[PDB]
Amino acid sequence: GGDNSVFDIFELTGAARKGSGRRLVKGPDPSSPAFRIEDANLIPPVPDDKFQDLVDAVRTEKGFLLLASLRQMKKTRGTLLALERKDHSGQVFSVVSNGKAGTLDLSLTVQGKQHVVSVEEALLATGQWKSITLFVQEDRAQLYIDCEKMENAELDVPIQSVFTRDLASIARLRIAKGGVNDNFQGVLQNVRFVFGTTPEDILRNKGCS
């Protein structure tokens, strides 16, 4: 894309610098840190200014590409990221690797109503490294798992419905944290939003990292 088109969430949080809530370990990418989650509550939020730039990119594109590498404990339901209200009253968006259901769940809360959909046949919690590419556009979600599998789902509302002009003033982006007892268990690496590019381009670059 153009200006501010790649957002690496762990870099933005400063998690690599701050010794709290994780252990730095190896991952598929030999050139970047990987994060074994210990206490997700202690991993800093994305700063407000950075988050508002992300929000504006999503609202502009009417969607996003989200890349992540994960090594998740079997049969666990683990939040990849969530947008949490600063008043502690709940989340407005999350992406959960649901190892209890074998799905990737996408939740949006708009106008007081929670809407959740499962991308089915997306068993990501295997105790082994997996790479995903999630492409959300309008009310459509398409998930590519490693370089072998595509699974799709339809959202009840367009993705941009949640991503408002002043969202950063009322909510924060948290990594690996969400729900009740749904913090991520395992390791994450290279959790990145990418704009102005297609899954086709990512997968040929072998973003099946």
From Swiss-Prot:
Localization per record: Secreted; Cell surface; Secreted, Extracellular space, Extracellular matrix; Endoplasmic reticulum
Q: Which cystines does this chain contain?
A: 147-208
The record's region (Heparin-binding) falls at: 23-71
Give the induction note: Expression is induced by PGE2, S.aureus and lipopolysaccharide. Induced in arteries and lung parenchyma following injury or stress. Expression in vasculature, including arteries, increases in normal aging.
The UniProt record lists the Laminin G-like domain at: 41-209
> Which residue ranges traverse the bilayer?
none
In which tissues is this gene expressed? Answer: Expressed by platelets (at protein level). Expressed by monocyte-derived immature and mature dendritic cells (at protein level).
Q: What does this protein do?
A: Adhesive glycoprotein that mediates cell-to-cell and cell-to-matrix interactions. Multifunctional, involved in inflammation, angiogenesis, wound healing, reactive oxygen species (ROS) signaling, nitrous oxide (NO) signaling, apoptosis, senescence, aging, cellular self-renewal, stemness, and cardiovascular and metabolic homeostasis. Negatively modulates dendritic cell activation and cytokine release, as part of an autocrine feedback loop, contributing to the resolution of inflammation and immune homeostasis. Ligand for receptor CD47.
Q: Which family does it belong to?
A: Belongs to the thrombospondin family.
Subunit structure comment from the entry:
Homotrimer; disulfide-linked. Can bind to fibrinogen, fibronectin, laminin, type V collagen and integrins alpha-V/beta-1, alpha-V/beta-3 and alpha-IIb/beta-3. Binds heparin. Interacts (via the C-terminal domain) with CD47. Interacts (via the TSP type I repeats) with CD36; the interaction conveys an antiangiogenic effect. Interacts (via the TSP type I repeats) with HRG; the interaction blocks the antiangiogenic effect of THBS1 with CD36. Interacts with ATF6 (via lumenal domain).
Q: Would you tell me the protein name for this molecule?
A: Thrombospondin-1
Originating organism: Homo sapiens (Human)
Q: Which gene encodes it?
A: THBS1
